Structure formats: C-alpha cells, structure tokens
Amino acid sequence: MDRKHLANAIRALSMDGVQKANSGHPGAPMGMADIAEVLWRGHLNHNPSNPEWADRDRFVLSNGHGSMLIYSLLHLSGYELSIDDLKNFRQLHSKTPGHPEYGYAPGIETTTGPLGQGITNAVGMAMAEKALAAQFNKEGHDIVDHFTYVFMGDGCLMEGISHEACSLAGTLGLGKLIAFWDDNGISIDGHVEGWFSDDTPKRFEAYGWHVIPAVDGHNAEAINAAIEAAKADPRPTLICTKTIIGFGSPNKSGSHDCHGAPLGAEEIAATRKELGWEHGPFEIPQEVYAEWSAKEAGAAKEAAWNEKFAAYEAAYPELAAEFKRRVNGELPAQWEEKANQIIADLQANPANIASRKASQNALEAFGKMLPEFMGGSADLAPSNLTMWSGSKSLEASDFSGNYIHYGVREFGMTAIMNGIALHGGFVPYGATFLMFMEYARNAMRMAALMKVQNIQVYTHDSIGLGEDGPTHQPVEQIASLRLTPNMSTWRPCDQVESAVAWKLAIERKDGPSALIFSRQNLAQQERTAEQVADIAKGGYILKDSDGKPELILIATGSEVELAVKAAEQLTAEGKKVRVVSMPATDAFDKQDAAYRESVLPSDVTARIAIEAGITDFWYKYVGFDGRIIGMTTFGESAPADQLFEMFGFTVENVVNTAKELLAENLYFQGLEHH
Amino acid sequence: MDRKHLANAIRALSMDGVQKANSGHPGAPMGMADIAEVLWRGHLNHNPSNPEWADRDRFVLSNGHGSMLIYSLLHLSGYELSIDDLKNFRQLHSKTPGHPEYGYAPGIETTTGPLGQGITNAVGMAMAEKALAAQFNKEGHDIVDHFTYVFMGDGCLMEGISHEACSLAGTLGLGKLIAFWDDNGISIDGHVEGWFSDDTPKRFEAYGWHVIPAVDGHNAEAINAAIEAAKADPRPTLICTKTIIGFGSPNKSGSHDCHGAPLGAEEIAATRKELGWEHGPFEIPQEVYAEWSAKEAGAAKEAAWNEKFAAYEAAYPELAAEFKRRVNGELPAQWEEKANQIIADLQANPANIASRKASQNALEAFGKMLPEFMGGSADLAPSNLTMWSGSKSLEASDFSGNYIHYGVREFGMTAIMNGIALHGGFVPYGATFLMFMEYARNAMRMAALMKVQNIQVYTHDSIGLGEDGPTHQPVEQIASLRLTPNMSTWRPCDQVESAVAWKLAIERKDGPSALIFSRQNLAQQERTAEQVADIAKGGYILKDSDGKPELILIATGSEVELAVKAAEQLTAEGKKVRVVSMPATDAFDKQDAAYRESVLPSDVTARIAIEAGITDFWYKYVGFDGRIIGMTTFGESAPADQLFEMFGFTVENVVNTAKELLAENLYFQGLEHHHHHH
Ligand SMILES: Cc1ncc(C[n+]2csc(CCOP(=O)(O)OP(=O)(O)O)c2C)c(N)n1
Ligand SMILES: Cc1ncc(C[n+]2csc(CCOP(=O)(O)OP(=O)(O)O)c2C)c(N)n1
Numbered sequence A: 001m002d003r004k005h006l007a008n009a010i011r012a013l014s015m016d017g018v019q020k021a022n023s024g025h026p027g028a029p030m031g032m033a034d035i036a037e038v039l040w041r042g043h044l045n046h047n048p049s050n051p052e053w054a055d056r057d058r059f060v061l062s063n064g065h066g067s068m069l070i071y072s073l074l075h076l077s078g079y080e081l082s083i084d085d086l087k088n089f090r091q092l093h094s095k096t097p098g099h100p101e102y103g104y105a106p107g108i109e110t111t112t113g114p115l116g117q118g119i120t121n122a123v124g125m126a127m128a129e130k131a132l133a134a135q136f137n138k139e140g141h142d143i144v145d146h147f148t149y150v151f152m153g154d155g156c157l158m159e160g161i162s163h164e165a166c167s168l169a170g171t172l173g174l175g176k177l178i179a180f181w182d183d184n185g186i187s188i189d190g191h192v193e194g195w196f197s198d199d200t201p202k203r204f205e206a207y208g209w210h211v212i213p214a215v216d217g218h219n220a221e222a223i224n225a226a227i228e229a230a231k232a233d234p235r236p237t238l239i240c241t242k243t244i245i246g247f248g249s250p251n252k253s254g255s256h257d258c259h260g261a262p263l264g265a266e267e268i269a270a271t272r273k274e275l276g277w278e279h280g281p282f283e284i285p286q287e288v289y290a291e292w293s294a295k296e297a298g299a300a301k302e303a304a305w306n307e308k309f310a311a312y313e314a315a316y317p318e319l320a321a322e323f324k325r326r327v328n329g330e331l332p333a334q335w336e337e338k339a340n341q342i343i344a345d346l347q348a349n350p351a352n353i354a355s356r357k358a359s360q361n362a363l364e365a366f367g368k369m370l371p372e373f374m375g376g377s378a379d380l381a382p383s384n385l386t387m388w389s390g391s392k393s394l395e396a397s398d399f400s401g402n403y404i405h406y407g408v409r410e411f412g413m414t415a416i417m418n419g420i421a422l423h424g425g426f427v428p429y430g431a432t433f434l435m436f437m438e439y440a441r442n443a444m445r446m447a448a449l450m451k452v453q454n455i456q457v458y459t460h461d462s463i464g465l466g467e468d469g470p471t472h473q474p475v476e477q478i479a480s481l482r483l484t485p486n487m488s489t490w491r492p493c494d495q496v497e498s499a500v501a502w503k504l505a506i507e508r509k510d511g512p513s514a515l516i517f518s519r520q521n522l523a524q525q526e527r528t529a530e531q532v533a534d535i536a537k538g539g540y541i542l543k544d545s546d547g548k549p550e551l552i553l554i555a556t557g558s559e560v561e562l563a564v565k566a567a568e569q570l571t572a573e574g575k576k577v578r579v580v581s582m583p584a585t586d587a588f589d590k591q592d593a594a595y596r597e598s599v600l601p602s603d604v605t606a607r608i609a610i611e612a613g614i615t616d617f618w619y620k621y622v623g624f625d626g627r628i629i630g631m632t633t634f635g636e637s638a639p640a641d642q643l644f645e646m647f648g649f650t651v652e653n654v655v656n657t658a659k660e661l662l663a664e665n666l667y668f669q670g671l672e673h674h
Numbered sequence B: 001m002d003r004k005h006l007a008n009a010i011r012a013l014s015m016d017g018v019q020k021a022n023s024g025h026p027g028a029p030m031g032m033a034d035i036a037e038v039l040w041r042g043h044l045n046h047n048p049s050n051p052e053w054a055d056r057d058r059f060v061l062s063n064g065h066g067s068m069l070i071y072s073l074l075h076l077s078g079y080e081l082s083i084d085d086l087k088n089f090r091q092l093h094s095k096t097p098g099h100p101e102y103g104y105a106p107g108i109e110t111t112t113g114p115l116g117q118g119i120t121n122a123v124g125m126a127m128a129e130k131a132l133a134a135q136f137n138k139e140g141h142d143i144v145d146h147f148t149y150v151f152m153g154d155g156c157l158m159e160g161i162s163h164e165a166c167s168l169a170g171t172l173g174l175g176k177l178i179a180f181w182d183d184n185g186i187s188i189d190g191h192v193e194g195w196f197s198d199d200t201p202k203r204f205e206a207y208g209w210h211v212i213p214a215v216d217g218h219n220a221e222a223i224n225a226a227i228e229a230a231k232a233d234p235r236p237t238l239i240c241t242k243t244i245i246g247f248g249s250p251n252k253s254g255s256h257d258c259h260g261a262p263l264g265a266e267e268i269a270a271t272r273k274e275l276g277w278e279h280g281p282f283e284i285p286q287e288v289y290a291e292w293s294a295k296e297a298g299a300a301k302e303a304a305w306n307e308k309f310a311a312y313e314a315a316y317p318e319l320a321a322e323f324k325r326r327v328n329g330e331l332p333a334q335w336e337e338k339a340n341q342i343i344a345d346l347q348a349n350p351a352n353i354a355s356r357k358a359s360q361n362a363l364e365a366f367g368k369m370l371p372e373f374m375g376g377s378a379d380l381a382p383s384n385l386t387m388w389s390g391s392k393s394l395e396a397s398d399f400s401g402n403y404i405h406y407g408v409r410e411f412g413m414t415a416i417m418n419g420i421a422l423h424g425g426f427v428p429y430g431a432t433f434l435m436f437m438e439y440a441r442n443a444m445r446m447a448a449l450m451k452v453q454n455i456q457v458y459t460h461d462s463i464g465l466g467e468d469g470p471t472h473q474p475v476e477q478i479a480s481l482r483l484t485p486n487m488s489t490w491r492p493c494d495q496v497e498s499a500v501a502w503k504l505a506i507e508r509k510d511g512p513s514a515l516i517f518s519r520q521n522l523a524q525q526e527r528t529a530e531q532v533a534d535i536a537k538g539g540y541i542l543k544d545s546d547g548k549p550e551l552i553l554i555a556t557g558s559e560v561e562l563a564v565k566a567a568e569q570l571t572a573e574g575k576k577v578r579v580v581s582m583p584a585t586d587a588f589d590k591q592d593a594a595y596r597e598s599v600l601p602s603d604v605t606a607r608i609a610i611e612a613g614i615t616d617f618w619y620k621y622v623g624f625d626g627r628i629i630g631m632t633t634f635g636e637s638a639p640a641d642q643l644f645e646m647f648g649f650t651v652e653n654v655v656n657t658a659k660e661l662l663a664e665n666l667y668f669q670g671l672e673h674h675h676h677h678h
C-alpha cells in the first residue's frame, strides 16, 4: 500500500476523534502525520504487546496538545487502545484524556501538555539510556541500545526550559536523542513572526547539536534521510521539519483556526476529499491495519533482545541480576536491615549539625548500597552538599558515573529527572536552594501528577540562611509544596529525622519527595525506638507531659529545639506541655484517625504551631483556638540569629504566647470547645 | 589619574565590605571593576543628586550576588550611600543588603539575586524607553533618550529565562539595550566546561543580537570601543567581556573559592600589594573621589534635559502634561467617577458571561481612559481575551502601540513587566492560563517583594475549563498566590466583581495583582450600592439572613452561584443562611476588626467554604467547626459540568453538608447549653 494512505489514517482518526469530542486540537496531528508514519513504520523499535520492554525506543510528544496524534499511532500500530477509546477522547474516565497522560493509555511514555517539558523529559530518558549503557554494556553484549525521539512545536522552543534542556544535552553529547521540530510558522496568537524570529538552526548549533535544516515534513524521502543522518551523528540531532498545520484542510490549513477547535462537519468532508480518504468516522480498512501493525515486528525484536540478554546473563550473572533489579525498581537485598541500623546508629550518636550536612551523611551511608543513585545539583554542590565519596560526574565521553552537574538550570534539571525516573534503572535526586524550587515548580507538580519518584534536596530553608536576604529566604515555599496533591514534603528537625526522610524518599516511587534542609546547625533530640519508628508517620509525640497535656507545641525542622526549650521552661513553671514534631504533614494526614487523635487530641485546643514559614498554613492544625508563631512577611538581609530574634522565634516569645493562650482557657472557655 | 587606580577603588571597597561582614561575594566585583569604571565614568548618563531623573540611563546588576560592585559604584560616584553604609553590608536594616534591593538604597534600579531576572528586567526597561520614545518624541524634541546597561554572569545565561527575554528582545529590535556578559569560566560548582559549553556569541547571533566577542574585560580601550560599537548598532548588543574572577587576588583568582566567601585578611593584604592599592579598609583618597564624582556632570545633564522638556512643553503642551502624568504614576483626571460609573452600569445591566470576557470588557471600558496601558499575553490573546479595540501590537519598527505578543514565555513576560513597571510611564498587564503562572512564579514573588505593579490576567481558573485536563486545571495555584506576602489575589464571581478587581489592580501600584478569571459563564449577583462598594473590601455579605445567621457559606469566583442556590434551598427549609462573597482574602484580612466581625462573626461557627480549589487553605476562615467543599486531588479530563458534579460542586452536596454540619453543631451546643459558665 502507498505510504500516503497510511499517514492519512492518522489524519482521519485525529480529526474524527476531535470532532466527536467537539474539543481538542486537529492542527498538529494533521501537520505531522507524514513524519509520524515514516518514524513509526520505518524506524521505531517497539513491541505493542509489551509497552515496558526495557530496550524499546522512547517516543515523546512534547507538543502534547496534538494528543490525537499519539492516540492514533498507538491504536494503528496495535497497542491495547481501541477504536472505542478514541471514540471516548476527552470523556469522563477514558484512556484518552485531552492531553496524553502516563499510565492512562499503554505506550504513553510521559504526561505532556505544559510546553517545554516533553523535550526536557526526553533529554532525561536519553541520559538514562546512555548511563545504563555505560554502566552495563560489555564487549559483545550491548544490552542497552535504544533511541529517544521527540516531536516539538514552536511553543516548546519559545519556552526557557528548552534552552536549559538542550544546552545541557549538547554538553553531555546525547547522540541518540533525535528531536523533530514541527516548523509550521503558527502558534495560538497566529503567524509567529511578530514574537518568534530566532534562527532556530543556528541556536541549536550553538548548543553543539547536529541540526538538519529545511526538511520537507511532507516528503517521506526527505524525512527518512534526515532520520538516517540523525542516527549516524554522535551529537543530539534537531530535524527541522517544515509542515503545514492542519495539512489536508482546504480552508483552515496554515491557519490558527485549526490549532485548537474542531474543524466542523463541512470542513471535515472537504478534507477527506482533498486527501483521497474515502472512509467514514473511525473506519480503518483492514489493509491499513495490516500495514500499520507493529505486533509481529515488535514481538520479534523483543524476542531477539531477550536472547541478547540471556547471552549477557550467562556471561555476566552478577551484572544481569543488578540490571533486572534496577529496571524493576527493586531495593537492594539488605536495604531495610541496613538502612534501619544506620538510623539507629544516628540516634545512638547525637551530632548537632545542619540537616543539609545530615543529608550528605545519609547520601554517603545509603549511597554505598545504591548504585542506581543518579544525583546532582543545579550548580550548588558545595552548598547543598549533594556529593559523597562515591559521586562520579557524568561527561560526554564517560556516562558510567552517578552525578550530574546540572548548571544553573532548576527547571530543566527537575524535568530531566522526571524523564530519568520514567525511563527506569535509577533513583534520581536533585538539589537547589529551597527558594529556587519556584523556578522548577511545574516540573515538581508534573512528578506528583505522573506519580514518579523525583527526590529534591532543597537546602537553606528559612531565614536561618541569614545574610543573603529576602530574595533567598523561603517563607511560603514549604506551604505551597504541602498544598500540592501527591507531594511528600519533609522538614527534618535533626540528623535522625533527616536519615529517615531520605530512607522514605528512596522508597517513595509513586511520587516526588521534597526534602527540606537547614543551612544552620540543628540540635539532636532524644527518641525511644518507638519514637524513631514514628518519624515515618510524619507527626509524632516528641516530648510528653505526665497526664493529659494542657498545651501542645507543634513544630517542624529547625524550630523543634525552640519548642523543646520553651516546653522545658513552661514545665518548670507547672505546665503540662506536649511537643509534637511534624516533619511531614502529608504523611501525618494519612495516618488513621486513632493515631492522629493520639498525637493531637481534639479536646486539647491550646496548640501553638512554630515554624519559620508562612503562618496561615497552620490553621489546619491549630484552628481558631490555637496560635501560630511563624512568618507573615518577607525576610531581611542580616545574620540569622538577629533574624530569628526580630521575627519572634525566641523562647521568651513562645513562653509568653503560651501563657497568654492558657489564660484564654479560663472561665471554661476552652472546655466548652467541641 | 591612571584608569586602573579608579577601578581598583572598586576592588578595595568590595573586598573590604565583604570582609567586615564576613559574608558575601567579592569575586565578581573584582572581576568586573574595569568594565564598570569605563561604563560609569565614560558613558553612563545619570545624576547622583536625582536618582529619579526621567531620562537617566538604567544600569542593572543581573549577577546580583556581586552587590558590593553596585554599592561601590553608587558611593564612589556621589550617591547618598556613605562609607558607613558600606561598613554595614549585610547587616540588619542597612541600606546595603546582601543582594541589592530596589526602594531603599538610591540608584538601585531593581532587586536582583535570583539569576536571570535582572537581564529580563532590563529587557522590559529597554522596552519601556523605546515605547515611551515612540509615544512622545517629536521632531527636534526627543525628550526620551536613554540606554539600558546590564551586567550578567554565566548563571544568568544558563537560566531558561535568559532565552525568553533575549529572544524577544532580538525580535523587538531593542538596540539601546547593552548587556555585558562576565565571561570568567567559573560558577559555584567550579570550572563550567562540564555543564556550560554553548557557543554563546552564536546563540545570541541567532536571537538577532549584535555580538562583540572576546572583549578583554581588563582593557579599558577595548571595553570603550565595544560600548561605542554597541550604541551605534540598532540591534541589542551582547559584549562578551572575558574577565578573571577575583582579579587581583594571587591565590583565589580564577577559582570558585573567591565566588561567595570572604577572601581572608591575609589574602586581602596580598591582593592590595598585587593591585598596588596602598589604602586601609574603607579609605578612599580625595583625588579618587574627585575623579569618580558624577555630581557636576550629572547636574548639568539633567539641567539640559529640563530645558529640553520646557521646549517640548511649549511646543506640545498636551503631550507634555500626559508625559508628566504618566511618569509621575498618576491616574487620569476623572478616573474615579468614570470607573465607578462603568461599574455601576454593570451592576444595573446584568449579564451572565465568563469573567474572562468581563475582563476583556473592563480592558475596553477602562483602556479608553488609559493610554499608559501596556498589555500582553503569553501567546493566548484569543483565550485570555487580552486584546480590545484599542490594542495595537508593538513591532521592532513601530513601538507606538500598547500591546505585546510575548510568545510562549510566561517567566520572561512576567519579569519583563517588572522592568516595565520599574521604568515608569506605563500600567502593564500580562496574561496566561492560571496553571502557567507556575512557570512565572518567582517573578510574581519579586514583584511582591519589590512592591511594584504587575497585573496578571490568569484565565481558566478551575476544573471549569474542562477537557484539557489536569495538566491545565488549577487546584492549588490560587492558594499559593494567597500565601505570598504582598500578593493581591482576586477571584471575581461575576462581571461586576470583575470590573472592581480591574479598577483596584490598575490603582495598585505598590504590589502585583493576580486576577483570576473563569473560562465559563458566571451568573451575575444582585447588589445594593453599598454591597458594590464593599467588593473592594475583599469579603462582604452578599446574601444575609433574616436575623442572626446560623450558617455561613463563604464562596469565591465561579462557586458563588452554587452557594447562593444552596442557601436559597436551606432558607426554604427554614434555616438562617448568610452568603459571603470573598473575591480577595488578602483585602479582607486588611479590614478592621469591626468589619471582619460583621462579615464573619465569631459566634457563628457553622461555616462552609466553597471553592473549586485546594481545600486546606480554607481552615483559616472555617476553623475546626466548619466544613470545606473544595478539591483534594488533581483534576481529570472530562467536560466541565461532569467534573463539577463528580467533585461535589452541586447544590445537593452543599445542602447535605450544611444540614449535617448544623445537626452536629446543634448537638454539641445542646450538651453545653445548661452549663452555667459563659
Ligand atoms: C507552558 C505552557 N504555556 C502555555 C500553554 C498553552 N498552549 C498550548 S498550545 C500553545 C500554542 C503553541 O503552539 P505550537 O507549539 O507552535 O503548536 P501548534 O499550534 O503549531 O500545534 C499554547 C500557548 C501550554 N500548553 N503550556
Ligand atoms: C535562580 C537562581 N538559582 C541559583 C542561585 C544560586 N547562585 C547564586 S550565584 C550562583 C553562581 C552563578 O555563577 P555566575 O553567575 O557565573 O557568577 P560568578 O561566580 O562568576 O560571579 C548561583 C548558583 C541563584 N542566585 N538564583
């Protein structure tokens, strides 16, 4: 069968899927159909019967609004995604949401939609392939060998994160990363000349990429030749495919009218005429299904690879076992035993250190067990302390290491790490000052949405950092992480909580981990072995009164010592005071009602939350009858001890607030609470 | 004097200021001291006695951590920044914080520190100059004519926002923007080759910039030639100044050790010897002060510009009064009565339209009175509805307009706008989907920290946007804006609250405004004239009960209609229900205790907050005894009305929740009723 009929099946399913939904974006799927057909039928190595084949090529659709394109590709080639699924595009609980979502449909490699992050995830997956290949491939046994293909549009290229991702991808020499730019000259505002006029080829040459300019995106021969050139060049390749958006529509192609609205029934009939497509809505001839099917090619490719791996396993049994364990996301053999012993050693051996130093100590203790670590920092290795004795930097000519110098690229680093975690085989971690979490904010939201592991070491977490001032001092950042669905946010109060937070983060594979560490030194607290085990519950009783407490101090991270010292002075003045350490509110929230009531009994309304962060978050735990000692403003440039005093993080202020609060409990005004 | 000696006065003050503080970054100041001396003493047009002079050149230190460089320049050239101020570097309440802060120290044009935003601010500043020139300059009367100079380091160039700002600046032909890149081969991790290897001149060439590569940043003649070439070229110019970081220090120069730590007393003495600087800590000889002073040149330059403006005013009195009005940040003559008439007309003439359309209607109605408007959208003009009939796009060849197509550049747009607001002459607004506020988040924070106007039209504010799904559907974003100090976040519930929010945002010149607009139609609510006036208080009684309420429904934005309907049903079943509209919690928080108690009385604890956003924010207003009807998950891709029903935003659920809540609260009251204590 002729090629153009096969490409035209993509266009028909796309425009029909969008029309039945009366919602969605037919432009880009129709403009890129030829490129997709050449790539998918001619070059992509994948098995539709096993979307998790470890050595499959990875395809990412970074211009994610053209979701019908990838849904069309998955259905046509034989994945478990049916015509009825396409008929349910953008409908309640379907496998075909309006933007493609990881784990919603088989073969979707990442969730896209926020522009720029698809290409950045793809840079990550290319880095994972290259590192796995450098760590596992042996002479005559190259068991890691697959490419990363990305489609992107003008929106992705305008976004700043494309500059971070692709600059670093050049430095690191990611020759198996192959990106197709949908150069169609249009974005939502219309003709892009007024706002997007880069020499895009020259830009990517400046990144050290291999760039193939001026490729006719509707010539199957030019597309095939560009892909062949790309696979042969050892630098990442940008293929600049010039296309017509909405290709096939007589009246709406080359216009922003076809970008993100249904074509309409009249225009759709005219498009079928123009393309010579004589089949109605969702009708694919069996001949097309035959020529598009990838099931037997893919079954043969995986069977071959399974034999390739069996040979590898005979010759390198220990390495093969490591490869199996890591690509399945399994922990090391004695993980639980060894990790818990490390934690108990820390509780036995108090150090008063900064929790960022405790973080480095946990990396050193746990990392000896975790060859799958792939750490890094956005140019802050000596302040975040993300390197330990075993850290080895990745470089273009040697990807066998385990540490990435991301440069000043918080957003790119965080979304690269999503691509690494999605790829499999590693436990990635990254780092920056907690303030500059904000530069990478949406990539962390995307990890929560995708339910992938993404461990962020966020140091310098409050006014405790001191002189660098209010552009650096977090105030509201911790709360904005706590308010994010499926974010796990840990603010350890000492080296023991720090190591527990790291152990849980390493184990946390269904969502991101924000590990919040202090610049300044933190006093270690005494804990029974039950209390150590209760750290993992996110909120636990650290100090208790004899008998029911009349006052509960809830504190996090660096403010716990302040709570403990104020509770000591109040106890010596006759008061019954409990101190609750709350390293992770999200873990505390998931504990059963019985546990939570045991920690914060509802009948004790005299509670004070103490945290060098935005106060308004804490009404959740103290309500109207409690008090909050926190921040309500930006910080100031000064030494930290002066900042803590100025902003009220003093034992005297906690004690006075407590006595004032206890006085409001007179005249039965507290006992009346129910 | 020898040129090098005047530059070394910068190096001396910088390293001495860092040493006294035992904190800060001496490397970059010492690296760029020669570039700074040539620029400031040989080209910068400024008046130390009036840092507010309208036609002064703008200087921006984008590598903000080298703050002792700009503090040295300000003190050396004659600004009101004393030796004692420099001796208080990084100390509590000083004029010299660890990163430079606009608003206190004279001469600080923006707050920097977060890498990449300074250069982006400068793009906006150059955009403001070029537009103010196009709108006001006449033949023989060019009253607007200044340059925008920026120093920036490798960190700013690695950051993605530099791509957004400089790509657009190329497209717009900002020829009076002149950026110096501190090309010293070093960042915090060390030698940058393992993580930063762009062909940076070629990169900027690709942006349509004028690039001057390989300038010796310690050669005054080369630096000077580069600047002259820059000012002659009509494209924005990148001057690639190679420097040695910490230049002068024998043992720490060219190394990341001098980046962000004090040099040490012994290294400083060796550095003094190496530089031939024979003066003690903070000691500046008199002939250095005399050679550095810009006071006389600066007073002459401004005096000359004042005469140019007197000539302009004589020739063009109406344009001149407009220039003075806009440069002084004043609103048009009849703003208050005309804007209030627009708002009263909307209350009188109900329309059920999406608040994003009401946003467009406010732009149209208010924009006719505001030639200072400078709007835009990050490639979403037809969805955000940011263009009205008077919108005219800026073009490289025609900057007389009032609208910017920012492209898909949320972070760059937002930080450019801070630059526009800092420059003066405009009321800027930008726009994107509320979700992609997250891309621009820290530029919104910087606006709030700096207390500058920055109006953002954030549309498609909830699961109400429907099928695009959870990558687009905001859940926790409104609450993140509400927790930011000096953020004003407005979620209007109909076209009347929408126009009030726009009126107050246009007036809000000391902080950013986040205006949260719906995709879908919103029912207009009825209001007395007093209720219309109380919209501006951020929270007010929309529907009161007959007698003291036993239940309060608190709602925002698209969920106010839901609360009104639920109250109607509850009132029909005999309950006493109050509906509070809370378009802006931050404005409500600032009302006095009497007003807040009148809206939310402490006696009435049966409260329900209703909002298609993250639930846990609302504990501030409902406490432990209320309920919250909101989101606790990401959204899902489906039609909007099925999402609202699935996530509990129905009259049935609100009514059922209220009835349970009241039965519970009446039960607990009953256990207490016969007790004798208060
Ligand atoms: C970060 C981000 N900002 C904004 C949007 C909104 N948006 C979706 S598609 C699009 C237009 C970009 O056009 P292009 O990538 O050229 O695609 P085409 O219309 O050619 O298919 C925009 C602004 C988004 N999805 N993500
Ligand atoms: C957005 C952001 N990310 C990280 C930082 C932390 N930081 C401050 S200075 C710096 C080093 C950047 O190096 P460069 O700009 O080359 O400065 P130089 O040391 O040469 O003066 C870093 C990572 C920051 N200030 N802002």
Ligand SMILES: [Mg+2]
Pocket: A153, A154, A155, A182, A184, A185, A186, A187
């Ligand atoms: Mg396009």
Ligand SMILES: [Mg+2]
Pocket: B153, B154, B155, B182, B184, B185, B186, B187
């Ligand atoms: Mg540098």
